[PDB]
Amino acid sequence: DAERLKHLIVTPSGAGEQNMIGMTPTVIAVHYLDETEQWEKFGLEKRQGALELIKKGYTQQLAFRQPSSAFAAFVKRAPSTWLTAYVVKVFSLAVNLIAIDSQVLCGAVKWLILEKQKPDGVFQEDAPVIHQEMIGGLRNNNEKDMALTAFVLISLQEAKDICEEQVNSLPGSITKAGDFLEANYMNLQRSYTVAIAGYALAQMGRLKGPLLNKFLTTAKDKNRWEDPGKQLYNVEATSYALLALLQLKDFDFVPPVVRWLNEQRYYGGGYGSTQATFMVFQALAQYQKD
Amino acid sequence: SKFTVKIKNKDKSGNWTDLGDLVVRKEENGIDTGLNAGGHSATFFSLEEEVVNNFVKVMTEGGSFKTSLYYGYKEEQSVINGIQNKEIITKIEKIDGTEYITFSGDKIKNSGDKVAEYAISLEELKKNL
Amino acid sequence: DSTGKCGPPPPIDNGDITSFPLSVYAPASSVEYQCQNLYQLEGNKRITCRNGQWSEPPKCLHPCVISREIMENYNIALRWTAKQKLYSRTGESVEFVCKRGYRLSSRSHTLRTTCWDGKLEYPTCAK
């Protein structure tokens, strides 16, 4: 770690989506190093330089914020539910690193609630991203409602503290989404879905009893949450699942999981890396914080 | 047998906005049409066997026919229960250089006498006959 | 009616204010409401702060969720679409058929129902 991460400090460039793909590694790189206190194995002169790229990224991304406080690849393109949820996800972590306008964040939050949440708590994507590689394991069509509702719900919960005061509707929305995940969770078949909705429910303290049993009995060899397919998806799934375990405070299950992720030698970066990169460092940072 | 044609309608501002899709089903006592507009998924209007040929003609050129029962979209009065023997009078209109089949339905509930108008592509109506 | 300042606007179920909430509102200041995706705002979308009190806020009229669980239980099915879930808005109508093999046990008109504040009258079929 740290010496490897040199490639994660990238200059954000491109449109509504491409600026985020490039912003992501720099933000989670600074976030991971900060918690892991690994600026000794890295230096101090780059911290100020890396914060400039995060400021650069935030500013550049603001050109893609629409009047509806939503985000899309271009100002004339229909807004992506996913990308808005992701912009919230990233910006929620970045509020502690750089200066994020709370209204920019809570405006996007409110938009997801008042426009893209369905009556049964489902979050729907009406303008899919152009760069499907950045969405990660969500690419799989099977159980999309469950996976997306969990993804968006996670973003609302990450933002909850900063936006609780500004968005009165926020807890009502979190519950409605939670109710959907809690209802259709036992019928889940994909390890990715059990993992992601596991973390979303754990955050609400709703991953209990049979649901909690399912989440834990889905893990292969009590260390990983995996499905046959891309390994990136399996790294991303076990990262959400680790984050869920840390929420449950199940420190008796957590060590084999952590070893498995460190064994994967995944240091982020690359095409389609966006979720795995953000998730594995968010999870491993949170693990050392606890 | 059965086919689906995309349908547009005049909103509050009078601008032609996408409504949904119209399912045209041929049965044993005429043609029953169904409207699929988001959560709305019920009969739009029904016909008798004796209107079938006249309907096809009117939907591909312009003119008028009698429907056994007419419902329309949620805006109209006819939606919940339906109005019997309603006439559908159609015209060929051009929206952004593309020719459609424009038709008036029923009045917008409580209002100052304003009927709802829908439009269905003349191309797709000819393709599925 | 007074120089009475108001507190933050009243909360509404399945909706929120189009602006960011202040703690104190001046007299004659007004906020606007927006309901969630398929919820119909019933009442005034704009509430004024007059005489140190807020106007009556609106209600978000519930849409109807038509799940395949419900349709399988009443031995019914959507007539016009292949969809297994449908989110009908308040005022939107929905037409079913008796799932192949079953006959209608409810009244004949009950095959077509309209959504009203989350309540859609499903018909019954039996065999």
Numbering used by the authors:
A (entry chain A): 996 to 1285
B (entry chain G): 42 to 170
C (entry chain D): 1104 to 1230
What text comes from the article?
The alternative pathway (AP) is activated by C3b, which randomly and covalently attaches to primary amine and hydroxyl groups on a target surface via a thioester group located in the thioester-containing domain (TED). The main AP regulator is factor H (FH). Bacteria, yeasts and even parasites utilize FH for protection against C. Typically, microbes bind FH to their surfaces to prevent C activation. Borrelia are able to recruit host FH and another host C regulator, C4b binding protein.
In our tripartite structure, OspE binds simultaneously to C3d and FH20. In our structure one asymmetric unit contains three closely packed heterotrimers with a water content of 48.8%. Consequently, three tripartite arrangements were selected for further analysis: A:D:G (trimer 1), B:E:(H) (trimer 2), C:F:I (trimer 3). From density it can be seen that chain H is clearly present, presumably at low occupancy and/or disordered. For PDB-deposition the H-chain was replaced with a short alanine polypeptide chain allowing the assignment of H-chain sequence to the structure deposition. The contact surface area between FH and C3dg is 830 Å2 and there are 14 hydrogen bonds in the C:F interface of the C:F:I trimer. FH binds to the side of the C3dg α/α barrel through helices α4 (residues 104–118) and α7 (residues 170–189). The contact area between FH and OspE in the C:F:I trimer is 674 Å2 and contains 13 hydrogen bonds. On FH, the key amino acids R1182, E1195 and R1215 mediate binding to OspE loops β2, β3, and β4 and the interface between loops β5 and β6. Our structural data suggest that the C-terminus of FH has a dual function: it can bind to surfaces and C3b simultaneously and facilitate down-regulation of C.
